[PDB]
């Protein structure tokens with residue numbers, strides 16, 4: 017078997033498992049306590065927070081632990097609404113700007129708020145030419161009531177990277193004018209789930225006020241975190257949860273020490289090795305694309321992740337094989353080596369996301385998402401490409 | 414060293430750790446996906462759900478996994494408010510009835526709703542006679558706008574068990590009359606965090622519509638679950654989170670398979686051994702109280718967890734040693750064997766009518782599965798020693 021669904025989830029690094037397993041046995045105490053077991057836990061959590069900050073070029077004061085990317089993403093949106101309501105408690109609705117290709121945990125909370133008449137939202141389309149939301153279109157959607165721009169750093173289906181530094185830069189410049197006109201500053205969030213561990217992620221270069229971190233996309237456990245620039249002092253955060261004071265009351269509940277241990281260790285590995293991970297992923301992905309074009313013919317392959325001049329994740333190859341019988345899911349069902357997907361694991365009809373990218377229906381119908389990882393080898397690419405060869409041959413008879 | 418703070422948290426059972434580590438290595442796949450590491454994951458999650466159902470005498474369809482007791486408790490409150498808003502949009506506010514001794518993850522979200530003028534809340538005091546919220550007072554607090562009664566099944570500080578079955582029964586009876594007057598039915602939740610694994614918890618006996626489960630109170634991992642009676646069909650649940658369809662869209666987010674594997678295994682051990690666990694804790698806790706009274710003298714000891722007639726957890730002993738110097742935190746600080754807690758004196762003990770002088774000397778000892786009578790003897794001697802040097 018060969019796994020190429022790393023965008024859906026990654027296995028745990030053995031050092032990550034070690035951190036978690038040891039924490040289970042040795043660090044089991046309530047972190048709020050002065051005994052060995054609880055003091056050990058507090059230390060693990062403090063160290064983990066430093067690691068996360070280091071991974072994204074931030075400070076630990078700006079990181080809070082969460083149950084995962086879904087929570088982190090929901091919390092940013094929740095907080096922006098609560099903040100608006102608190103400013104007015106002193107019927108206008110807050111406005112959000114986002115992209116047409118966001119994860120369910122950004123798109124769905126925003127749809128819900130529109131349905132419920134709590135907020136206004138602009139879903140900015142991606143360019144059919146660049147595959148990015150144009151920064152001009154984002155700036156053209158601004159209203160007096162706009163309070164958040166949320167744009168994913170990299171798309172999970174295509175791998176396409178969004179122009180988040182430009183967005184932040186242009187929003188900061190706009191905000192100077194807004195504040196001077198009595199219009200509150202617009203905050204910027206990016207869902208960085210798919211970028212972490214695949215390319216450098218640095219909050220100063222990104223310029224963002226919030227950033228979502230998702231452990232299971234970078235060989236860490238199924239918990240997450242949220243970066244909040246100057247949490248408290250510069251960026252407000254209104255909690256969704258109320259209880260016993262943990263995470264400075266931004267995210268109460270007894271801390272999950274083993275999960276935090278794992279997340280911290282997964283972050284350390286990214287900090288040490290990101291450049292090597294990126295290099296490896298790119299070599300094997302590019303090699304996959306070369307072998308697919310040599311084996312099937314350049315005329316028969318649509319590279320759906322390639323938009324001219326647009327940066328993408330090093331590990332992602334979304335592509336389609338031309339043929340009326342070669343719908344993605346049917347091709348995968350005949351493969352005996354390849355384990356991959358046709359889109360988001362959680363959506364397991366063509367991908368709405370690909371259609372939003374302007375991929376024609378005949379192509380989108382045949383799309384397969386292969387996403388490689390740290391251990392993936394060229395020999396494994398060769399095995400996968402032969403597997404695809406036999407599967408297409410099977411369906412063509 | 415001897416641990417007697419199991420009400421704060423438990424260590425993990427060895428079996429629980431193995432379920433988790435096995436899932437880490439072998440069941441790492443996305444559960445939403447189809448393939449080895451991922452079918453393995455979905456299998457684990459399904460089996461765990463059945464285990465949790467079995468522990469509480471319910472069905473797996475009525476169980477959702479959460480990140481912990483705080484999320485589960487907040488989710489119940491949130492849902493009741495949303496439901497009320499949904500009903501009205503086709504300035505009335507929902508009303509909640511709760512107790513004065515709830516955990517921060519029930520008390521604080523309710524306080525926040527009062528502060529934000531989103532809901533009305535009655536915090537019903539506990540009687541200083543029985544140490545329980547009187548069911549009469551709960552029913553007397555009912556309003557047309559009442560939508561939820563939430564009363565913790567056992568208190569974490571004192572161990573005192575609340576009359577949740579009576580509460581549920583009297584509310585169900587009220588509801589027949591309410592519905593026939595065009596008044597919506599009142600739902601009942603119990604935070605069962607402190608009862609699970611210490612005494613039998615059964616949703617049919619309890620009569621509740623919602624029930625919070627907290628893994629780290631019963632030798633499981635730091636995640637949780639929520640029971641919702643006839644989830645979908647009978648009891649509404651409006652989610653807090655939006656995302657990719659997991660937990661039937663009641664609680665989206667990629668499932669934490671290893672945590673779930675551990676919670677399921679912890680639940681399996683409770684189902685298999687709950688009675689043995691109860692009997693052991695009761696023996697050891699009762700021996701603790703005997704040995705305290707023998708060593709310090711009966712008149713020297715206030716047993717704060719003891720109200721005559723009133724049921725309590727088998728493992729909990731909240732007590733005070735009478736003495737000007739013997740404030741709880743100072744006594745613990747001088748102990749070299751006992752590891753425990755005091756819970757300023759506890760606001761919860763004050764709410765129980767414990768006089769200030771006794772309250773501030775209060776120590777909370779809560780014993781566990783492994784605690785022995787020999788360990789009790791060590792702890793009681795350590796206490797004597799500690800008291801002696803604070804008395805010079």
Ligand SMILES: *Cc1c(COP(=O)(O)O)cnc(C)c1O
Pocket residue numbers: 260268269270271420421481482483484516518565567568569604606607627629630
């Ligand atoms: C421990 C506990 C909880 C859950 O709190 P978490 O910090 O989220 O584990 C809830 N209620 C009671 C009574 C508890 O003792």
Ligand SMILES: *Cc1c(COP(=O)(O)O)cnc(C)c1O
Pocket residue numbers: 023024084085086087118119121168170171172207209210230232233657665666667
């Ligand atoms: C995987 C992922 C997430 C995190 O969602 P969870 O299911 O909670 O892990 C968030 N955003 C994107 C773009 C993702 O790919």
